[PDB]
Amino acid sequence: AGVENVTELKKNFNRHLHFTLVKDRNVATPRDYYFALAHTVRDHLVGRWIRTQQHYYEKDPKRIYYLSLEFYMGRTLQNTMVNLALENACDEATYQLGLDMEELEEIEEDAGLGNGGLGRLAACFLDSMATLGLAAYGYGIRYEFGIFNQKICGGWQMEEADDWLRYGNPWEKARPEFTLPVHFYGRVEHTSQGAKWVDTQVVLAMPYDTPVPGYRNNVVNTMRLWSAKAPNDFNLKDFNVGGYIQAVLDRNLAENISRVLYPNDNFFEGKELRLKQEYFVVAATLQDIIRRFKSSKFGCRDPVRTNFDAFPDKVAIQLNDTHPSLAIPELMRVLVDLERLDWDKAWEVTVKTCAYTNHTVIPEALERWPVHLLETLLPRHLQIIYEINQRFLNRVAAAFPGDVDRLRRMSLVEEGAVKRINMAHLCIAGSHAVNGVARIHSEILKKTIFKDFYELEPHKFQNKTNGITPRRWLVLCNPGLAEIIAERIGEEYISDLDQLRKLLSYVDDEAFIRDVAKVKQENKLKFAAYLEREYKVHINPNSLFDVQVKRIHEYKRQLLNCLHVITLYNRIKKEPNKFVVPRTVMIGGKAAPGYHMAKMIIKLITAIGDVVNHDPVVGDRLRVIFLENYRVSLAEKVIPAADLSEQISTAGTEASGTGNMKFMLNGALTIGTMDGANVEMAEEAGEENFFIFGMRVEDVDRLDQRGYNAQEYYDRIPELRQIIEQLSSGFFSPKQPDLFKDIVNMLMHHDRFKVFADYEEYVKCQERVSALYKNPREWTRMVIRNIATSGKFSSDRTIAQYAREIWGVEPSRQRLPAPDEKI
Amino acid sequence: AGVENVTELKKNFNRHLHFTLVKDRNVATPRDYYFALAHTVRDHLVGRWIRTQQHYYEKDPKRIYYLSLEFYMGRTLQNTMVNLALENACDEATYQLGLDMEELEEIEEDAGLGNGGLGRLAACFLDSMATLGLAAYGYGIRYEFGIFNQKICGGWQMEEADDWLRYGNPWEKARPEFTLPVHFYGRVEHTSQGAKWVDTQVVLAMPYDTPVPGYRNNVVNTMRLWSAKAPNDFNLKDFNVGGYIQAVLDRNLAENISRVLYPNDNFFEGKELRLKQEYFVVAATLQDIIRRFKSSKFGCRDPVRTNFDAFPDKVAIQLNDTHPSLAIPELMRVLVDLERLDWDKAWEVTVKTCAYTNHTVIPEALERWPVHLLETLLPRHLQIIYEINQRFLNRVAAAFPGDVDRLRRMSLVEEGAVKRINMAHLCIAGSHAVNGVARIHSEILKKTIFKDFYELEPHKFQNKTNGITPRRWLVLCNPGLAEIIAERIGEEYISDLDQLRKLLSYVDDEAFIRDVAKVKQENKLKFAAYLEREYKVHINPNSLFDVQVKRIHEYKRQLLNCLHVITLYNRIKKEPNKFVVPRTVMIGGKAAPGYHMAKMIIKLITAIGDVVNHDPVVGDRLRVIFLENYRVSLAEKVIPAADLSEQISTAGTEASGTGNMKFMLNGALTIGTMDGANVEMAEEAGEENFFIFGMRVEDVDRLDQRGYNAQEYYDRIPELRQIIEQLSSGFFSPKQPDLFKDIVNMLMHHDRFKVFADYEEYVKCQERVSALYKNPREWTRMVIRNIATSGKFSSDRTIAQYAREIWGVEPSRQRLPAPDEKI
Ligand SMILES: *Cc1c(COP(=O)(O)O)cnc(C)c1O
Ligand SMILES: *Cc1c(COP(=O)(O)O)cnc(C)c1O
């Protein structure tokens, strides 16, 4: 609240219902009400957005361009209000108008533009870059369809189109006026001055901008996402008859480029359509960059010629994964072919400008494009690429004289009866810095897959542990919590998570301990109920909520959790009159369509729940639930409500993880392996304050050396063995005896993740979990140790690191002056 | 002007530049300026729009639904201001802000949703229906692409996509909340209660509303145009795998329905796509209608059951041409199949509700659908249709006992080795009224093509001469003129064109005569200049501007005009030192892609200009110009600037014409045949006050009886004969001797329009034109007689007639009370 402001907001809300929506109070739906509030908050954002940009114009700082094919933003309304601090007023304002804001918020559809970790990261970054006063821009694609809505039918995932712009998107701003052409196909003509790319087919890239407000600093940066539009004539040009009408219809072909996001996480699919997406983002983006460089305070900058030598002094391009790797030869192409810079000079520039982040070591996720694909779609780019390789291999050669295998190993070109380009090698070669996202990940990169690279240029490899935004991930989703903490230490911690440590002072503090546990129960009650309203639940609120939410994958080992769960059901069924800690096990996440195994997995979960939830001997005791359509908005409701976070990837598979960090801040204890960021988390909180288990990296490696035999486990562990037979015999699929005989085969003959090898220790560590939960006060003190020690995981420390060690910029906590415009 | 209002407008303009466009005065383009003004005017329109609708709700009048596949609206900004009377203020407001409004207006793209006459008519209607206080709604399709932009290249028409929504459309309002399903394909199952339409494929119809403000009466009606959207699941449903991604892409198929307008004028093309368009408009529309009937003050209307007997008392559906003819069986379908009404009862209803307007007698324009097309796409509709026929032919049978040919002649089903449905017969059978658009047209309908029908039910046939809106067509495009007239008789004539007659008093009135001729010259100067700016002109302002603007067609006889023009060039070239009235002959209009002849024609015009404009012996004297991309906005600039309107269709081909009427009001003298509305125009103004010529209907018929032989003309007229040889010999196509040997063939062996048969009289009447022009004062007095006598041609008289003799409603001149909302 605060009366004038409240007077204002009520006024504007009324103005947009009428004017903007063209609706009357006798006809508006909560949906209209939603949109009316959105447009009121949005106004509060314009002057600042305009000012920020104006500011960068004449202030001309180095700019950071964050290129990503994914921006997994979720809802924007709550988050803009938090950031603008309008939350209470909006609340009052809507109270008096009589509306239930929280009810309005649920009407907002998520902006589901990514698949999971990589895209959520990009979204946290932007908020961190904005909160830190950097002149940064996120560039992506405006997909008409984000990641699909996941439906569960008869136990199976059914995918339906995420029609996110149906009702409109109040936060973006079409910028048809800044549409630029993108070229595809054609042929090259090396002639006189040099090479020309001709008889190409053109697609227009049209930008849409979305504001990204920093935490109460009067800063609003931009997220520019391109939309594909077909040119107006070929699409009726050429000698080009064949139907006037059909030619008009044929525009689809072309606009198809930004139609939908490829729904694969940590999986590479060599489809032309994806490659066009990657080229399109990059080509349009680079023009914008160049445009901005040349027109800026250089706007004048008369005579070198037009200088690029200063390029790296004013621009940084960050490659989120190899997705946008084409930015490398695209920058060379332009500099060279269009700007007429000598290779040497341009390469230098490129290097100093580009930086690449690796997100995984899984071989199947790596991008290796068939050259036949490139040759065709981007002939000039393959030429450039061959060129880089040459020059690149001439450098190794010199360094490791005679080392003939190394040459073959580091080549960007994989000759092999399907000659491919390794996108990762192109990226290291063309960038001044390469970082892993977790120190362990970073260490393994340099010890293995990129060993050769490191040896050639140690100086290029860095580490930048990932983070999460305390705004969305604490303040927005768990206000009870932020509150109880604020009471104690106040608020400077929302933009300085580190101060959470002063929290160690209340571990032994009883009013504290009761608050912490109390907010935790409330969250729980709010989740249980939501469960019911929105579906059919009847979940046990005074049960340990054990949640595993992330994309479904073999490496994630939702299966091991599945094993845990049947064991539990099995012990119970064996000695049912015995008291055990009640638990509500929740698992959710999406599987890419066609990742047969991921689909099999979900079904298996549903299968267990079908059995477990209908056993009268089980009672209150065990509940298994598959959480349908997990995405940003769902994560905001379930995370704050959980007690135990399952982060159990086979050590060395999960590069960092971030769901990781979200649970730590909302007070859940973590059960996990020493993989990714869990290593650092445990590190910061103390190993006694985490439920660690299983093999470490060296362990895995030592087993692989031996050769892994699941038969041995099966053979040596009765419990495990019985689960098998039950999976195998139709225990969980009556109708269809052999339904899961597939997971069995895999578990038994080809489990690349050695599920069985960490089973015994996992079940054992889980008992320890249960033991601690029976002692409330003790479970809460530990949790306190987790919350207290989470500040290192804010995306603000992360961004501060990138800024300083790669971008060469300085974050500011400084507030843009910026109210507005009156006269 | 008017100071407070001006203060307001300036304020709001400023508000939207900032807030709505998110632009600053250091960055806005005239385009932004345009959009900022549009959004300010639009606000002035909402309360009235909301109020109007609210008013109809509780006032519950009979509603009129005008169904059309075309709504050729043009620009909306000027027209909303005229209607809201904000024109001066906006002018001031923009003055002081320093902008040149007129310059801003040119930025608005036309809403090119129709092809010519039929669609422009629908647009005039809405304005008339609104000005007359009727509770009327226009229903159509929101095409993403209207009629194509016409480019002329090397003398030929090149068509490019009319990408009208590129930059957005400020006047519409998406209504995603009122999307309804439309069904296609399926099969029928006759069972128990009756027939069911199953296993159909569904497309969603999403409405977009546009306000239609009446002339200063505080009334704003709605234009609702549907957009095709694909359902969210099949488009990923069924067992329906085959690519998750490809399934997503496949949504195009479906949204393809509203992608573009078919660019044929007075031409029927039996393409499935068009039929889907026709079904889609109708199905979505009917639901809205039914919805409105049942929910309205019947909202209560408890027990008959739900009564339809009152249906015709609350609804009128007007079929613009047979395009929407499916409304007939669609209404039966619902009433019958869904509402479970006995056929008899429903038929009765249908009849009393539907009315159909015929727009042409040309056989090639008539819709005759292959039943194989229907059987498939709309199986239940073909069943219904067969049913109507039966019952229908059982009525003739009874009436004309034994008359076996009549039966065959009136059948809705044309058996004939491609069995087709005659859309026109279905329409007469199912409607209580059928009207022609010109009394002559109306008389010929009943004398010929529908002779049988008339004989069966004389009472169904009417006449409703077309009209034009004096708002767009006088006030908006020729303010000088409206002014000079206003000075004399004031303004009640904008909504009572009839008062234009009091104008007879100044014929012999010299200050009048000078005004009239003066505004005419100004208009001329403004056109000539526009010519130059926008292109390359150098047109003779003190020349008789002879214009023929309409769609290119054989029946229109742009060729005869072409003949006129070469003759002139020929006489000149023969006795060049002889004085003649200088003339600038302008011809423009679009040809449907693939109407080879129409394309040939344009080229021929360009061809003549290539020759004529570069003959030094011609000089100032003759100028031939092809006006590229003629459409609503162009008509508004050229009509007011013309001196002679060419309305020269072979008598009996042009049903009415309306370009007809536009020229009469902007003071042009008319050269024409006694065809369509020219008959009535000449009638009202006096035959001595028109340049009439050629054969009348009876004449044509008498020649056809003889058998038409162009050789006879060629043989008997030297002038004509020489033109031939020149066309034939390469006179106008050096490079390509035989280019036009095609038009020649046609002219000579197969001219269905008997161009040659009206050549002599045409050239003769033209001399008379020239004679009068040499006497300014006399040309102006005549013109005065034309303007004075034009009131009958306002769309207001037209709409008043429809209202009273078909809709059974009463127009009102009564002003909605309606300012707004304060507190
Ligand atoms: C944070 C987040 C992720 C990443 O979770 P991990 O457990 O690191 O894989 C995936 N999806 C959503 C919706 C998220 O919020
Ligand atoms: C009025 C009008 C027409 C109809 O002109 P006719 O001469 O009756 O065929 C066609 N096109 C446009 C743009 C119009 O304004």
Side-chain angles (χ1 to χ4, degrees), chain A residues 15 18-19 21-23 42 46 145 159-161 173 175 177 232 236 251-252 256 820-821, chain B residues 15 18-19 21-23 42 46 145 159-161 173 175 177 232 236 251-252 256 820-821:
Chain A
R15 183 232 293 185
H18 188 69
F19 294 112
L21 292 95
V22 166
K23 234 106 150 106
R42 165 221 221 275
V46 254
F145 302 98
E159 6 253 280
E160 350 138 63
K173 171 71 149 94
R175 319 233 105 139
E177 3 166 339
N232 46 279
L236 98 36
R251 309 199 114 198
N252 296 321
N256 269 356
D820 245 49
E821 54 101 58
Chain B
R15 183 232 293 185
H18 188 69
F19 294 112
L21 292 95
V22 166
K23 234 106 150 106
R42 165 221 221 275
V46 254
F145 302 98
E159 6 253 280
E160 350 138 63
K173 171 71 149 94
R175 319 233 105 139
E177 3 166 339
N232 46 279
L236 98 36
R251 309 199 114 198
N252 296 321
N256 269 356
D820 245 49
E821 54 101 58

Side-chain angles (χ1 to χ4, degrees), chain B residues 164-179:
Chain B
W164 86 295
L165 297 140
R166 191 141 32 122
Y167 294 103
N169 180 194
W171 312 111
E172 47 180 26
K173 171 71 149 94
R175 319 233 105 139
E177 3 166 339
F178 330 95
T179 305

Side-chain angles (χ1 to χ4, degrees), chain A residues 72 110 115-118 120-121 124 265-266 468 472-473 548-551 553 555-556 630-636 639 646-647 654 656-663:
Chain A
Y72 206 175
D110 286 40
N115 279 281
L118 178 167
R120 171 74 225 170
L121 189 76
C124 276
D265 175 291
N266 288 299
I468 234 108
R472 183 160 316 253
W473 307 115
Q548 182 179 203
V549 296
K550 55 183 67 234
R551 283 295 278 280
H553 269 285
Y555 96 81
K556 287 137 124 96
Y630 169 72
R631 62 203 142 100
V632 182
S633 304
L634 195 70
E636 290 172 1
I639 309 151
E646 304 273 349
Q647 257 122 240
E654 193 73 82
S656 166
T658 47
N660 223 195
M661 318 176 175
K662 296 179 192 162
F663 282 101

Side-chain angles (χ1 to χ4, degrees), chain A residues 146-158:
Chain A
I147 210 290
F148 68 81
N149 285 282
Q150 172 200 60
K151 153 125 214 173
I152 279 114
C153 182
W156 324 75
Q157 160 170 306
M158 301 310 298

Side-chain angles (χ1 to χ4, degrees), chain A residues 666-679:
Chain A
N666 287 288
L669 284 306
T670 290
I671 170 154
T673 60
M674 280 300 203
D675 203 10
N678 301 341
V679 188

Side-chain angles (χ1 to χ4, degrees), chain A residues 14-15 17-24 26-27 31-32 42-44 46-47 49-50 54 144-148 158-163 165-168 173 175-178 206 229-230 232-233 235-238 244-245 248-249 251-253 255-256 259-263 269 273 593 820-821, chain B residues 14-15 17-24 26-27 31-32 42-44 46-47 49-50 54 144-148 158-163 165-168 173 175-178 206 229-230 232-233 235-238 244-245 248-249 251-253 255-256 259-263 269 273 593 820-821:
Chain A
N14 285 300
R15 183 232 293 185
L17 191 77
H18 188 69
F19 294 112
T20 305
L21 292 95
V22 166
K23 234 106 150 106
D24 200 70
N26 241 235
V27 51
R31 164 172 293 114
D32 301 316
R42 165 221 221 275
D43 297 333
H44 285 66
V46 254
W49 190 16
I50 292 172
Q54 169 50 93
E144 301 177 43
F145 302 98
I147 210 290
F148 68 81
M158 301 310 298
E159 6 253 280
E160 350 138 63
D162 162 40
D163 196 1
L165 297 140
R166 191 141 32 122
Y167 294 103
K173 171 71 149 94
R175 319 233 105 139
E177 3 166 339
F178 330 95
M206 156 148 186
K229 141 150 273 167
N232 46 279
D233 61 30
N235 271 168
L236 98 36
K237 229 208 250 312
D238 277 341
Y244 153 60
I245 283 239
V248 172
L249 307 203
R251 309 199 114 198
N252 296 321
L253 270 37
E255 311 193 334
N256 269 356
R259 206 136 268 101
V260 60
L261 160 78
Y262 269 75
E269 203 199 74
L273 185 51
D820 245 49
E821 54 101 58
Chain B
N14 285 300
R15 183 232 293 185
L17 191 77
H18 188 69
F19 294 112
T20 305
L21 292 95
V22 166
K23 234 106 150 106
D24 200 70
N26 241 235
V27 51
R31 164 172 293 114
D32 301 316
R42 165 221 221 275
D43 297 333
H44 285 66
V46 254
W49 190 16
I50 292 172
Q54 169 50 93
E144 301 177 43
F145 302 98
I147 210 290
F148 68 81
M158 301 310 298
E159 6 253 280
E160 350 138 63
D162 162 40
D163 196 1
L165 297 140
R166 191 141 32 122
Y167 294 103
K173 171 71 149 94
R175 319 233 105 139
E177 3 166 339
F178 330 95
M206 156 148 186
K229 141 150 273 167
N232 46 279
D233 61 30
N235 271 168
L236 98 36
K237 229 208 250 312
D238 277 341
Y244 153 60
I245 283 239
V248 172
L249 307 203
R251 309 199 114 198
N252 296 321
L253 270 37
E255 311 193 334
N256 269 356
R259 206 136 268 101
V260 60
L261 160 78
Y262 269 75
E269 203 199 74
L273 185 51
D820 245 49
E821 54 101 58

Side-chain angles (χ1 to χ4, degrees), chain A residues 470-488:
Chain A
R471 271 81 66 195
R472 183 160 316 253
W473 307 115
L474 172 65
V475 183
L476 193 151
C477 65
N478 194 356
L481 183 63
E483 170 141 59
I484 58 70
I485 292 164
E487 283 170 39
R488 294 341 167 276

